[PDB]
Structure formats: structure tokens, C-alpha cells
Amino acid sequence: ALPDSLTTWEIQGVGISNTGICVADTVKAKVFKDVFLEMNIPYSVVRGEQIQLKGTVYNYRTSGMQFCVKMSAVEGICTSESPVIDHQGTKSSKCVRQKVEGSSSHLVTFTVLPLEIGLHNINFSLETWFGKEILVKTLRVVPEGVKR
Amino acid sequence: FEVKEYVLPHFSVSIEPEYNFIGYKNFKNFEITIKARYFYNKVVTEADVYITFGIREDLKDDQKEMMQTAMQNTMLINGIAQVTFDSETAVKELSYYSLEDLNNKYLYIAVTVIESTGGFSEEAEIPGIKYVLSPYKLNLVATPLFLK
Amino acid sequence: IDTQDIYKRIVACASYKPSREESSSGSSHAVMDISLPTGISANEEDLKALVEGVDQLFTDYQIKDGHVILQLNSIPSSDFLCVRFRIFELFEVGFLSPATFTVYEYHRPDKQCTMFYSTSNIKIQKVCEGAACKCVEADCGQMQEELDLTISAETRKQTACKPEIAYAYKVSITSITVENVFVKYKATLLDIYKTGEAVAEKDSEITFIKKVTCTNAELVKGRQYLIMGKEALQIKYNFSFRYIYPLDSLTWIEYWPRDTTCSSCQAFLANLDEFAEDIFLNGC
Ligand SMILES: *[C@@H]1O[C@H](CO)[C@@H](O)[C@H](O)[C@H]1NC(C)=O
Ligand SMILES: *[C@@H]1O[C@H](CO)[C@@H](O)[C@H](O)[C@H]1NC(C)=O
Numbered sequence: 001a002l003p004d005s006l007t008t009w010e011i012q013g014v015g016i017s018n019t020g021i022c023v024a025d026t027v028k029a030k031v032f033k034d035v036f037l038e039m040n041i042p043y044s045v046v047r048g049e050q051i052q053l054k055g056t057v058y059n060y061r062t063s064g065m066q067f068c069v070k071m072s073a074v075e076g077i078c079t080s081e082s083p084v085i086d087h088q089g090t091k092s093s094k095c096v097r098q099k100v101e102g103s104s105s106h107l108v109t110f111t112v113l114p115l116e117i118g119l120h121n122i123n124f125s126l127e128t129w130f131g132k133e134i135l136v137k138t139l140r141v142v143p144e145g146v147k148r
Numbered sequence: 149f150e151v152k153e154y155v156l157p158h159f160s161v162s163i164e165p166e167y168n169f170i171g172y173k174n175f176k177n178f179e180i181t182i183k184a185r186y187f188y189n190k191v192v193t194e195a196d197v198y199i200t201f202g203i204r205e206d207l208k209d210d211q212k213e214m215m216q217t218a219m220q221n222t223m224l225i226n227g228i229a230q231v232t233f234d235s236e237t238a239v240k241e242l243s244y245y246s247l248e249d250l251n252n253k254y255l256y257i258a259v260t261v262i263e264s265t266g267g268f269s270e271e272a273e274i275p276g277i278k279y280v281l282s283p284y285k286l287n288l289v290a291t292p293l294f295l296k
Numbered sequence: 297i298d299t300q301d302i303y304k305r306i307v308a309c310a311s312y313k314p315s316r317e318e319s320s321s322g323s324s325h326a327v328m329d330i331s332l333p334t335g336i337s338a339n340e341e342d343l344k345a346l347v348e349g350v351d352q353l354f355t356d357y358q359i360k361d362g363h364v365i366l367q368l369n370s371i372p373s374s375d376f377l378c379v380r381f382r383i384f385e386l387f388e389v390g391f392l393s394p395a396t397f398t399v400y401e402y403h404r405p406d407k408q409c410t411m412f413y414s415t416s417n418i419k420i421q422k423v424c425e426g427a428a429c430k431c432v433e434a435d436c437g438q439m440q441e442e443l444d445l446t447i448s449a450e451t452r453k454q455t456a457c458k459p460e461i462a463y464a465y466k467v468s469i470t471s472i473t474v475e476n477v478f479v480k481y482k483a484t485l486l487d488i489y490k491t492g493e494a495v496a497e498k499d500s501e502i503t504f505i506k507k508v509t510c511t512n513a514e515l516v517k518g519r520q521y522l523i524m525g526k527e528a529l530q531i532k533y534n535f536s537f538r539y540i541y542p543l544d545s546l547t548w549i550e551y552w553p554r555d556t557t558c559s560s561c562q563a564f565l566a567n568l569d570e571f572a573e574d575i576f577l578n579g580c
Contacts, residue, residue: 006188042391043155053391054268056265082526083462196387262390269390
């Protein structure tokens with residue numbers, strides 16, 4: 001079963017026999033989705049400071065649509081919005097649906113300040129017309145000063 | 149194998165110069181093509197492209213002064229963009245010397261591409277392009293040097 | 297370091313730290329570095345004023361690797377030396393790399409004081425190492441005026457029924473521990489209305505913290521105030537207790553009269569009781 005990613009997968013193989021070594025031509029397996037969401041996911045995200053955490057929703061569907069994106073964070077990363085409803089784990093972003101033009105994209109921003117050492121799992125749920133899907137992203141943090 | 153923090157870039161940015169290395173005719177006029185494509189093979193619809201120019205003495209030198217002029221900002225349309233940059237105005241007083249004879253050394257150009265439709269960023273660069281008074285070079289291939 | 301909208305200006309105001317065995321005079325030659333966020337540049341014509349000046353506090357200035365380099369001869373031990381400059385920023389980025397403000401003596405590069413800063417406004421603030429905050433939003437609230445005659449009894453129901461407003465109850469402040477920066481506000485619960493999930497009971501004597509930056513929300517010790525605000529934050533450094541109150545911006549705080557009555561007049565207290573009974577009987 002193919003892994004879930006927007007990028008094109010390049011599979012490659014080599015073979016060994018008494019005849020000799022043979023490298024097969026690289027097979028490009030393209031994995032695409034009509035309506036999907038992806039985010040920057042910065043590396044190491046220093047602790048104590050708030051981050052912009054920008055992401056973009058893509059619509060390849062010819063017809064227009066309205067999208068809703070909510071964020072759920074494990075304990076703990078300080079959020080500037082709140083509250084958590086209905087479930088204690090589920091974090092409502094109180095998302096207002098914005099119009100996304102056909103063959104266009106829209107911007108999504110989340111201001112969050114991590115309070116503890118990573119890596120912590122942070123979910124971004126996407127509620128939209130033409131189906132809905134949620135991706136799981138991990139956020140890692142690092143202490144302020146460094147001396148080895 | 150390289151050990152680094154890769155971040156795993158979202159889209160590919162390829163920089164194709166019309167000519168490999170700048171000659172006499174290309175000093176007054178130099179055109180360069182900037183083309184950025186997603187990893188799912190679908191070209192970037194619309195994005196903002198910022199170009200940075202600079203001059204370097206050698207390849208080993210990581211740091212050198214630069215203009216101070218532009219910083220020309222053009223928008224990537226349908227996965228392709230192009231811009232013309234002349235050396236005559238470029239170097240001048242900014243590089244403290246102006247001539248093709250005065251400065252014989254590499255030219256480094258930086259490109260920063262951001263998506264206008266949604267948050268993402270990718271960067272690329274050209275290690276260098278040297279202005280040479282003596283074009284090309286000469287070499288022999290598949291020609292053993294012997295006489296019959 | 298601080299960034300205000302009042303083109304945007306950036307100030308430094310840094311000083312030298314005296315040593316017990318060292319008489320305070322000034323500091324040795326030190327390089328002052330300011331890291332500009334990716335896609336942000338500063339105006340050189342505005343920076344030239346430091347060099348051009350008859351009185352020279354700075355020998356040279358430079359821009360290297362997207363950083364601002366300016367060398368200072370002596371750092372004042374008495375007061376903080378300020379540096380002001382205007383910036384020109386062009387859109388972007390995917391993610392802004394944390395901007396650092398650092399200063400180091402040119403003699404020893406070994407030890408460098410570094411502090412992070414952000415040009416954008418701070419939504420989340422006040423994160424304590426001891427009590428493990430648990431923000432505490434940055435925005436500032438305001439307290440209603442003392443003995444505001446009527447105007448209005450109906451408006452209180454609208455404010456309390458707000459989905460964002462969770463705890464609306466009558467409390468009496470007991471003890472106050474000033475800063476840094478907490479303002480604990482030890483109180484006592486006389487009565488509850490909502491009192492929605494997950495908290496409970498009565499006479500629990502709970503506390504709510506507020507940053508000292510708000511002088512308008514100052515409470516008088518011993519005077520009972522009716523407080524309606526956001527849901528209580530969970531826990532602390534202590535794994536038990538477990539429900540401390542935020543006291544954030546746009547919280548309803550109004551003085552509840554105890555003493556006479558008629559204070560010109562007692563009729564105001566009836567307007568407060570109507571809101572209590574209406575929200576208790578029917579509610580949101
Ligand atoms: C993301 O959704 C998954 C589904 O398995 C779940 O395991 C996890 O609780 C989620 N993470 C958060 C922070 O809500
Ligand atoms: C929690 O904090 C208090 C101070 O408010 C401290 O004195 C006490 O030890 C703690 N309570 C418990 C039950 O551990």
C-alpha cells in the first residue's frame with residue numbers, strides 16, 4: 001500500500017546474477033489528491049517563543065468550494081483562541097468557511113507557543129465540500145541556549 | 149551521505165540561464181529563466197519571485213558584497229517566469245569598478261520564491277557565473293596523437 | 297528590545313553589567329548584532345545618522361549575512377544605551393526564523409548574550425518557569441466604574457450568556473501578592489450563577505491572576521466584585537489544584553455594594569439582583 005504524501009515517489013531497483021549487475025530504470029509513482037492540505041512544519045521550533053505556523057489548502061477541483069480547518073494540539077502548546085468543544089481532546093478553531101476559487105489555493109495561519117520539550121504531535125483537521133480529511137503532523141522543540 | 153536538517157522542501161525551483169557563462173554580447177543584456185514546479189508534477193499557478201544578485205572572487209569564498217540595486221520582484225505565472233539583468237548598470241560604483249576587463253570573476257545569483265495564494269517558501273541559488281575575456285577552451289577527444 | 301508601530305522603529309536600550317569587584321564606569325569595546333527576520337531589511341540612510349553625528353557613539357556599521365553589524369566603543373554602566381532604526385520589509389515567508397538580538401565584547405567572542413524577538417504583535421504572553429504557565433492571554437481588560445447608576449441591568453445578561461464567557465459569579469477579594477508578574481488576587485466565593493463546567497461548589501476561596509500592565513482592572517482589598525470571565529486554565533506546577541482562574545481581557549468586573557444602601561441609592565443593588573435571578577431562573 002502506497003504511503004500518503006503529495007510528492008512523487010521514485011522507486012528504483014538493482015539486480016545481481018552470474019551474468020552481472022543490472023540497474024532498472026527509475027519508476028516514478030505519482031501520488032496526487034484533488035483537495036488536500038499541507039503545512040510548513042518548521043524544524044526544531046525553539047521553545048518559549050510563538051510561531052506563525054503557515055499552511056495552504058489546495059483545490060484542483062474545477063468548481064469553487066468553502067473550506068474549514070481546525071487545529072488540535074496535545075498537552076501542551078499555548079493557543080490564542082480556545083475553547084475545546086465538544087470533546088476535551090478536540091480543539092474547536094471556530095473556523096469560518098472561506099471561499100476557494102477553482103484551480104486556486106488559500107492561506108491558513110496558526111499562532112502557537114510550545115511550553116515543553118518536543119517532539120509533540122499536532123493535528124490539523126480539514127472540513128470541506130468535496131469530502132473532508134485530517135493529517136497528523138509532529139512538532140519538535142529545542143531549549144534556548146547551547147554550550148557543549 | 150549528508151547529515152543535516154532538511155525540512156523536506158515542498159516544491160522544486162529550477163534556475164535556467166539562457167547562456168551558461170556571460171560573454172561580450174551578454175554583458176549589456178542577460179536573460180535568465182526561473183521555473184518552479186510542485187513535487188506532484190503540477191506547475192505552480194501563481195507565486196511571488198524575488199531575485200538577488202552578487203559578485204564573488206572564488207568558489208571557496210562563501211561571503212561577498214552585493215547590490216544594492218535590486219531585488220527585482222516578478223510573479224511566477226503558470227509555473228514559469230523570466231527576467232533580464234544587465235551588468236553595465238549592476239557593478240558600476242556599487243562594485244567600485246565598472247568594465248568587463250576590470251572584473252574577471254564569478255557572479256552569484258539568489259532566488260527566493262514565495263506562494264501568493266498560500267504560505268510556502270523555497271530558495272535556490274547559482275554557485276557562480278564567471279565573466280571571461282577569453283571564451284571557452286580547447287581539448288581533444290578520441291584522437292590518439294600518432295602518425296601513420 | 298521592543299518593536300512598536302509608532303515603516304517600523306526598532307529600539308535596543310542595552311547596558312553593561314557591573315562586577316562586585318569592578319567599580320562602575322563603562323564597558324570594553326563590543327560588537328552589537330541585530331538579526332533581521334528573513335525578508336526584512338533596514339534603511340541605511342536612517343542608519344547613516346549614527347556615523348555622520350558630531351558626537352560619535354559608533355565607529356562603523358555594516359550588513360553581513362542578513363544581519364546588522366555596528367561596533368560600540370563603550371557600553372554605559374549607568375543607563376541603557378538606545379539604538380533606533382526604521383525597517384523596510386517585503387512580504388514572504390514560509391516560516392519566519394526566530395530573530396536574535398546579541399551583543400559581545402570583540403576581545404572575547406566566547407560568551408555572547410542572545411535574546412529572541414518578533415516584529416509581529418504578541419498574542420500569547422507571560423509564561424512562568426516556576427508555575428509552568430499556562431497563559432494568560434496578552435490582551436488587556438477593564439473594570440466597570442464604581443457605583444455606575446443603572447445603565448444597564450439588561451446588558452449584563454447579554455455579556456454572561458456569551459459562549460466565550462464561562463464563569464460568571466460573585467466573589468470577595470481577600471489577599472493580594474504583588475507581581476512578578478502575577479497579582480494572585482486571593483478571593484472568596486459568595487454566590488454562583490454559571491459556574492458552567494467543569495468547576496463547582498462554593499466558598500472555595502479561589503484566585504485569579506492578571507498582569508500588572510493593566511492598571512484599570514485594579515481591585516480593592518476587602519471589596520466584593522462581581523466577576524464574569526473566560527474558562528479557568530487547568531493545573532499548575534502542582535499536579536493538584538487544578539482549576540486556577542485566568543482573569544483575561546473583556547472580563548466583566550463590577551463593584552457589588554455591601555455598605556448602605558441607601559448610598560444614593562439602594563435601587564442600584566436591585567438592578568444587580570434582577571440579572572442574578574434572571575440568569576439563575578432561565579439562563580443561557
Ligand atoms: C490525531 O488523530 C489521531 C487518530 O488516531 C489520534 O490518535 C490523536 O489523538 C490525534 N492527535 C491530537 C493531538 O488530537
Ligand atoms: C500546592 O501549592 C501550595 C501553594 O499554593 C503549596 O503550599 C502546597 O504544597 C501545594 N498543595 C498540595 C496539596 O501539594
